[PDB]
C-alpha cells in the first residue's frame, strides 16, 4: 500500500492512511502521536518512519525534530531517537538501510545539515553538510549515492542539485535541473531521478523532468495534469504516485500516477481531505 502520514489543512494533521491501488480503498489507520506537516516518510525493514516536519496548531507551532516510526503488523507507532535539529520541509533517503535526513528549516535556521539514522542501534549522528541551505528540498537515492534536488535558501529557489557519496563523505554539484523547484516531489523511478511539481516563486508547476546518470542531464518529460507544490511522491510497482499539494488556491486531494512506458500521467483516486505537506512511503499491507 501507499502510506501517507501528516500534512496540511490549516493545522498540522495526524492522519495516517494507506491507499491500495488495485481495491481503490483508503484505509483509516493510528494517528500520528503529535499532528506535523513538511515531514518525510521513508520505510527500512518492512517499516514506516515519519521525519521532521512541523506542528501548525492552533495553540502555537513548532517545528519537529522527531523520528518515529510505524510498524504495520500491529498498527502502531513508536517514538524513536530525535534528530540533532528540528527540520521542517526536509527531505530524506534510505541507502545501506540508514535514514539520511537532508536540509529543511528550523525557525529562521535554513539547514544544509544532514544527518544518518541507524535503525539498528536507534542513534543519529551528523554527515557532511550540503553545498547550499536547502528548504522543501527533494532527495533521492540512485546507486547507492544520495541526491538533494532544489530547494528555498531562505532568498532564492533552487535548480541546482548536488550529490552525496556515502563512503566519502562529500557533497558534488551536478547539473542543475532545468526548472527552479522548491517543495517538489523527487523520487527514483526504473533508473533516473524525477523532478515532478514544486514552486519556484511565481508559480505552482506541473512540469516533470528527469536525470539520467550516464548522460548526466536532465529531460522534460509528461506534466502533470495539476500544478502542486509540497505534494506528496512514491513509486508503486514501477508507476509514480503524487498525492495532494497546493496549488496556489487551493489543498488538493487529487492522485496522480505515472505510467512511464506510455509517458502519461493520469487521476487514479481522491484522497479523503485535501492536504500538502505529507510525507508517503511504500510498505506490506496492515494485518487486517
Given at each position: ?34 499532528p506535523r ?6 520505510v ?177 518529460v ?21 498525492l ?18 506510455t ?26
Amino acid at each position: 500500500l501507499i502510506y501517507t502520514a501528516g500534512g496540511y489543512f490549516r493545522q498540522s494533521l495526524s492522519y495516517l492512511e494507506a491507499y491500495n491501488p488495485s481495491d481503490g480503498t483508503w484505509l483509516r489507520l493510528a494517528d500520528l502521536q503529535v499532528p506535523r506537516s513538511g515531514l518525510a516518510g521513508c520505510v527500512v525493514g518492512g517499516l514506516l518512519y515519519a521525519v521532521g516536519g512541523r506542528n501548525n496548531s492552533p495553540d502555537g507551532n513548532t517545528d519537529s525534530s522527531a523520528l518515529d516510526c510505524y510498524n504495520p503488523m500491529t498498527n502502531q507507532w513508536s517514538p524513536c531517537a530525535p534528530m540533532s535539529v528540528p527540520r521542517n520541509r526536509i527531505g530524506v533517503g534510505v541507502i545501506d538501510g540508514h535514514i539520511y535526513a537532508v536540509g529543511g528549516s528550523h525557525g529562521c535556521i535554513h539547514h544544509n545539515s544532514v544527518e544518518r539514522y541507524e535503525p539498528e542501534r536507534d542513534e543519529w549522528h551528523l554527515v557532511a553538510p550540503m553545498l547550499t541551505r536547502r528548504i522543501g528540498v527533494g532527495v533521492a537515492v540512485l546507486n547507492r549515492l544520495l541526491y538533494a534536488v532544489g530547494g528555498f535558501d531562505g532568498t532564492n529557489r533552487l535548480n541546482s542539485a548536488e550529490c552525496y557519496y556515502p563512503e566519502r563523505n562529500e557533497w558534488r554539484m551536478i547539473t542543475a535541473m532545468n526548472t527552479i523547484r522548491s517543495g517538489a516531489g523527487v523520487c527514483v523511478l526504473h533508473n533516473c531521478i524525477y523532478a515532478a511539481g514544486g514552486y519556484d516563486g511565481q508559480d505552482q508547476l506541473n512540469s516533470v523532468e528527469r536525470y539520467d546518470v550516464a548522460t548526466a542531464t536532465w529531460t522534460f518529460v509528461a506534466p502533470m495534469k495539476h500544478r502542486r507544490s509540497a505534494l506528496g511522491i512514491t513509486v508503486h510497482q514501477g508507476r509514480i504516485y503524487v498525492l495532494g499539494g497546493y496549488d496556489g488556491h487551493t489543498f488538493l486531494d487529487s492522485v496522480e500516477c505515472y505510467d512511464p512506458d506510455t509517458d502519461t500521467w493520469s487521476e487514479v483516486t481522491r484522497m479523503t481531505s485535501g492536504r500538502s505537506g505529507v510525507g508517503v512511503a511504500v510498505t506490506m499491507e496492515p494485518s487486517r
